[PDB]
Paper text:
[name] directly binds to LATS1 and LATS2, and additionally to two related kinases, NDR1, (gene name STK38) and NDR2 (gene name STK38L) via a specialized [name]-binding domain N-terminal to the kinase domain. Key to its function as a Hippo pathway activator is the ability of [name] to bind directly to [name] and MST2 kinases. We demonstrate that autophosphorylation of [name] and MST2 on several threonine residues provides multiple [name] binding sites with varying binding affinities which in turn contribute to a redundancy of [name]-[name] protein interactions in cells.
Peptide overlay analysis (here referred to as Far-Western) revealed that peptides bearing phosphorylated forms of [name] and T367 consistently gave the highest binding signals across the array; nonphosphorylated versions of these peptides generated little to no binding signal. [name] [name] and T367 peptides displayed high phospho-dependent binding affinities for [name], with Kds of 280 nm and 680 nm for the phosphorylated peptides, respectively, and no detectable binding for the nonphosphorylated peptides. The observed binding modes revealed by these structures are in close agreement with the binding modes reported previously for a yeast Nud1 derived phosphopeptide in complex with human [name], as well as a MST2 T378 phosphopeptide in complex with human MOB1B (see ref 21, 22). As predicted by prior mutational data, the [name] pT353 and pT367 phosphopeptides bound to the [name] phospho-binding pocket first identified by Rock et al., with the phosphate of the P0 threonine directly coordinated by K153, R154 and R157. The p + 2 side chains of I355 and V369 in [name]-pT353 and [name]-pT367 peptides respectively pointed to a distinct surface composed by M87, Y95 and the aliphatic portion of the E94 side chain on [name]. This considerably longer peptide sequence (31 residues versus the 15-residue peptides described here) appeared suboptimal in having disfavored basic residues at positions p + 2 and p + 3, and yet was reported to bind more tightly (120 nm) to MOB1B than did the consensus matching shorter [name] pT353 peptide.
Author numbering:
A (entry chain A): 15 to 18, 23 to 211
B (entry chain E): 5 to 9
The structure:
């Protein structure tokens, strides 16, 4: 793995403090930290977790299994930005997740949005940019839960997915990063946590 | 973006 900077302690700080079991406290802004930097650091880690979580069930999610992006039959997702695609496009769950993951990555590699220099302020619209990222990442949990959960449990990956989702939901709730409207696919699960 | 049934 990666071996051995402020955002990086912030990350290892966030990961380690989760081990107290009390996720509501662990997700809170540490004393005197930049709110944007805290959100940015956790947003990246969430992208990485959800990227590897989906990567474990990748072989069961196919154009044949999932002809549309679904969180149950009550919710379907079509891809748009818009920059390259401004009108939402019906596509498969693997293709859609590709577009979403490539797009999240593209924003993470954008130094105007996520400055890698430690003294450069985050943009004024950063808060809006991060809310859009996390809102779409949630739909990757949503599709895995509603469709590929048998595969998640066939692999030993249930606790991984559950702990990461709990962490994700508590973080999103603490900072007001996602509306009820968007969390409705996982409603019953979010109430139980 | 997000469609219902
Ligand atoms: Zn699928």
């Amino acid at each position: 793995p990666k071996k051995n900077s402020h955002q990086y302690e912030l990350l290892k700080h966030a990961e380690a403090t989760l081990g107290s079991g009390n996720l509501r406290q662990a997700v809170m802004l540490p004393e005197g930290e930049d709110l944007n930097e805290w959100i940015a650091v956790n947003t990246v880690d969430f992208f990485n977790q959800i990227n590897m979580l989906y990567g474990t069930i990748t072989e069961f999610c196919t154009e044949a299994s999932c002809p549309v992006m679904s969180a149950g039959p009550r919710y379907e997702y079509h891809w748009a930005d818009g920059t390259n695609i401004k009108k939402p496009i019906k596509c498969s769950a693997p293709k859609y997740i590709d577009y979403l993951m490539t797009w999240v990555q593209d924003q993470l590699d954008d130094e105007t949005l996520f400055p890698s220099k430690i003294g450069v302020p985050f943009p004024k619209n950063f808060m809006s940019v991060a809310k859009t990222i996390l809102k779409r990442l949630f739909r990757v949990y949503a599709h895995i839960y509603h469709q590929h959960f048998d595969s998640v449990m066939q692999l030993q990956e249930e606790a991984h997915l559950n702990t990461s989702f709990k962490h994700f939901i508590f973080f999103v709730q603490e900072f007001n990063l996602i509306d009820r409207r968007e969390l409705a696919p996982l409603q019953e699960l979010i109430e139980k946590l | 973006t997000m469609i219902e049934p």
